[PDB]
Amino acid sequence: SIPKEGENIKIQSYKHDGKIHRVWSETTILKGTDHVVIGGNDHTLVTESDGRTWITREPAIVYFHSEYWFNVICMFREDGIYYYCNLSSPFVCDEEALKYIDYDLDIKVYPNGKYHLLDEDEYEQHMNQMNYPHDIDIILRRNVDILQQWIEQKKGPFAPDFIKVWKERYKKIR
Ligand SMILES: Nc1nc(O)c2ncn([C@H]3O[C@H](COP(=O)(O)OP(O)(O)=S)[C@H](O)[C@@H]3O)c2n1
Ligand SMILES: [Mg+2]
Ligand SMILES: [Mg+2]
């Protein structure tokens, strides 16, 4: 269930009600442990909940954690490194895909480290629509605060040395 270095896997995002939200066709595994999966993608197919397919335009490093209720996409844009952070269940892997539940809230980090909390309105609506339990609401709000603290500390995927190491590892294996 821990994916192997050099494996190309699919990543599947679901909503709390079990419906698929988003699917990424191809991510090359750079690190796979008990607690952490790191991957790279570039010009992967992406499929939406209506079946429509689009293609990513720039390389990204993805970071998944088995304990924390978030995952992080590090995007290498012409105007600098952006992060897109999903509040989520932790991941599970199997032969089909790395899988997680998307919980609406996300954080955008700009190249200079400034962050914006996104989709608070969508989270409130979906939490009422899909009846998220109170404990999930407590966990997600706590993990918003943890993610902000990691961004401010440049911890984990937000470390400049993380980006230097994994950007170069992905550039070589691709
Ligand atoms: N070209 C294109 N076409 C689509 O249909 C797209 N759908 C999503 N992207 C985006 O995928 C990422 C996330 O989309 P989002 O922030 O709107 O996600 P949710 O989960 O809040 S709906 C990219 O930032 C990026 O904006 C799409 N990009
Ligand atoms: Mg999200
Ligand atoms: Mg969202």
Side-chain angles (χ1 to χ4, degrees):
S1 57
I2 297 161
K4 298 205 174 73
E5 185 185 355
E7 196 166 346
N8 269 359
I9 69 161
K10 185 148 64 176
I11 298 163
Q12 297 184 179
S13 176
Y14 300 73
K15 305 305 302 190
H16 181 85
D17 69 357
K19 293 205 163 46
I20 285 280
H21 183 52
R22 187 165 294 112
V23 180
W24 294 258
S25 289
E26 288 190 290
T27 298
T28 306
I29 301 306
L30 311 173
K31 174 175 194 153
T33 72
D34 294 312
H35 293 152
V36 172
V37 172
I38 303 171
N41 54 53
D42 190 9
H43 288 71
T44 180
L45 268 29
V46 188
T47 307
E48 299 293 311
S49 61
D50 56 9
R52 283 182 165 90
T53 311
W54 59 277
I55 303 184
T56 66
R57 286 142 169 78
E58 73 273 302
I61 297 295
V62 301
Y63 173 96
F64 294 91
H65 205 289
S66 69
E67 305 171 325
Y68 291 97
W69 284 61
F70 51 79
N71 57 66
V72 176
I73 314 291
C74 324
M75 293 172 296
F76 293 96
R77 294 190 65 78
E78 199 172 324
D79 71 294
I81 302 158
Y82 286 75
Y83 297 87
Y84 185 95
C85 313
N86 293 294
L87 280 293
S88 61
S89 72
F91 74 95
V92 300
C93 297
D94 61 32
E95 67 174 323
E96 288 178 332
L98 183 150
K99 306 170 173 170
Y100 68 89
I101 308 178
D102 180 285
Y103 280 112
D104 314 303
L105 296 167
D106 8 66
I107 299 185
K108 176 184 182 186
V109 184
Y110 291 73
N112 76 354
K114 166 172 68 185
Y115 61 82
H116 295 169
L117 175 63
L118 314 181
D119 288 336
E120 277 194 277
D121 45 13
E122 168 180 81
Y123 173 67
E124 288 293 317
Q125 291 297 300
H126 284 185
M127 168 160 60
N128 286 326
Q129 283 155 230
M130 288 184 274
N131 298 115
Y132 304 167
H134 287 289
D135 285 354
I136 286 184
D137 181 52
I138 294 164
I139 287 168
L140 292 169
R141 294 172 202 274
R142 183 199 299 126
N143 280 255
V144 167
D145 286 351
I146 295 167
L147 201 47
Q148 292 179 0
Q149 295 302 116
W150 282 34
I151 295 158
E152 295 163 35
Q153 295 159 349
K154 289 182 172 51
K155 181 166 177 175
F158 309 109
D161 283 351
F162 174 101
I163 293 297
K164 286 172 187 182
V165 169
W166 298 113
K167 176 192 188 306
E168 291 299 338
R169 293 291 176 77
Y170 184 41
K171 178 151 165 273
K172 280 216 174 51
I173 209 163
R174 94 168 167 270

